[PDB]
């Protein structure tokens, strides 16, 4: 009880700290702290990186003429591919900067930190008597982040295909998908959009009804309003089922969209309705899918450099 190990265990496991630590805490704290430190330093004063591996460096640091919107941390070089490139493997620190190691450092440490945050959620929930199913809800954003940052590069074969840590980087990321894989027509992205929009709708409407009902009745009063507003009597008359539905809709939507991105990593595709309507004599009549395909074709042609010096 008084052993140094016992004292350390009690301190780590104590719930009287302002922020609970736990063992998942002891793992995640250094990881996330290193990630954020390196992220800030690279965002502020990082030198150019050759993302494409054709000796055409891309500047993304603030000191090199950039704003908040246009700045980012460029992913690793295409030459490294999917290899492991730690700091002590590069010939010199300058070469390490030129190739783009800090992206790998950030992504690895951040992924470990988020997983251990997931674990710590359950740990604290268990230390207090709560039920343990908040980690399941948190799995959706964690799954999406893991997909985008780790599974897509593995499928494509290089870390240069990951999402740059920025804003304009994210926009370029989205545009390159819409050029290459036709994400907009993939059913899983449709389910993700539906999940997000339905979550916003349900949040707004639940807030409205609950605030209206609360008078200086919480569910038996507003239910009369809802049953006659848009019909649909006796749908969610149990206060627990309603909140479970709220927790379930967006989580399932995000799970499906993450699985869709993971499947695209192995490159099946979105839907493809090109030239799906033809009259007699074999002539082709254009549909909206053809206009979308023209936009995608222009996008893809613009992206590819092909002639690289």
């Amino acid at each position: 009880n008084s052993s140094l190990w016992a004292r350390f265990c009690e301190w780590i496991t104590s719930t009287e700290n302002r922020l609970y630590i736990g063992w998942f805490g002891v793992i995640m704290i250094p990881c996330l702290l290193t990630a954020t430190s390196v992220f800030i330093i690279a965002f502020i004063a990082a030198p150019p990186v050759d993302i494409d591996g054709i000796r055409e460096p891309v500047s993304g640091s603030l000191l090199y003429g950039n704003n908040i919107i246009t700045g980012a941390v460029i992913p690793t070089s295409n030459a490294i591919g999917l290899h492991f490139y730690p700091i002590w493997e590069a010939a010199s620190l300058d070469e390490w900067l030129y190739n783009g190691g800090p992206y790998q450092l950030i992504v690895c440490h951040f992924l470990l930190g988020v997983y251990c945050y997931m674990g710590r959620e359950w740990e604290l929930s268990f230390r207090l008597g709560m039920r343990p199913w908040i980690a399941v809800a948190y799995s959706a954003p964690v799954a999406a982040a893991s997909a985008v940052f780790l599974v897509y590069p593995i499928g494509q074969g290089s870390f240069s295909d990951g999402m740059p840590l920025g804003i304009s980087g994210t926009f370029n990321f989205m545009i390159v998908f819409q050029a290459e894989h036709n994400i907009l027509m993939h059913p899983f992205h449709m389910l993700g959009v539906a999940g997000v929009f339905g979550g916003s709708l349900f949040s707004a409407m639940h807030g409205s009804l609950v605030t209206s009902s609360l008078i200086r009745y919480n569910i038996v009063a507003a239910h009369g309003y809802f049953g006659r507003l848009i019909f649909q009597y006796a749908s969610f008359n149990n206060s627990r089922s309603l909140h479970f539905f709220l927790a379930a809709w967006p989580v399932i939507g995000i799970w499906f969209t993450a699985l869709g991105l993971s499947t695209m990593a192995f490159n099946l595709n979105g839907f493809n309705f090109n030239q799906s309507v033809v009259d007699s004599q074999g002539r082709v009549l254009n549909t909206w899918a053809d206009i979308i395909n023209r936009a995608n074709l222009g996008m893809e042609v613009m992206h590819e450099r092909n002639a690289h010096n």
Binding site: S59, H206, A247, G298
Partner: protein, 150 residues
């Protein structure tokens, strides 16, 4: 706003459903409730402490929480509407003139913003051919923008 609304919905549902009071012998907690209940079905204190020890800040007022839920998406969509109203007059945020001048000065300076501008050029050039038939546009293949020519 939209992403925060989804986040609030999910987190509130998960917290309420994972802090229910023991008022039912059955394994399922759905049937341990009736609409005519007097007290709330979940412990605010436990959830408040949990989220004050995990995240750092937690709600302590039901009315404020549900009002925040209402407030977020409405403001987000209103701001989006104002943005599209501005766009209707071709008042678009497109330039970042300093970056454009610097890029035009020397070719050897590339940011993701310039790549986005080039992608927009490609989209316009390759889609206007059939998107706007009334313009009667015929771009020869020589002039169509392509990455091979940069």
């Amino acid at each position: 706003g939209v992403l925060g609304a989804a986040l609030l919905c999910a987190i509130h549902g998960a917290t309420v459903e994972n802090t229910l009071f023991e008022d039912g012998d059955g394994a399922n907690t759905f049937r341990a409730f009736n609409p005519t209940q007097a007290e709330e079905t979940y412990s605010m204190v436990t959830a408040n402490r949990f989220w004050s020890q995990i995240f750092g800040v937690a709600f302590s007022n039901k009315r404020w929480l549900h009002f925040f839920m209402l407030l977020v998406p409405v403001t987000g969509l209103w701001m989006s509407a104002i943005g599209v109203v501005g766009l209707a007059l071709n008042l678009r945020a497109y330039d970042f003139v300093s970056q454009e001048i610097r890029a035009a000065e020397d070719p050897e300076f590339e940011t993701f913003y310039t790549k986005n501008i080039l992608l927009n050029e490609g989209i316009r050039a390759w889609m206007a051919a059939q998107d706007q038939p009334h313009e009667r546009l015929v771009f020869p293949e020589e002039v169509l923008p392509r990455g091979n020519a940069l």
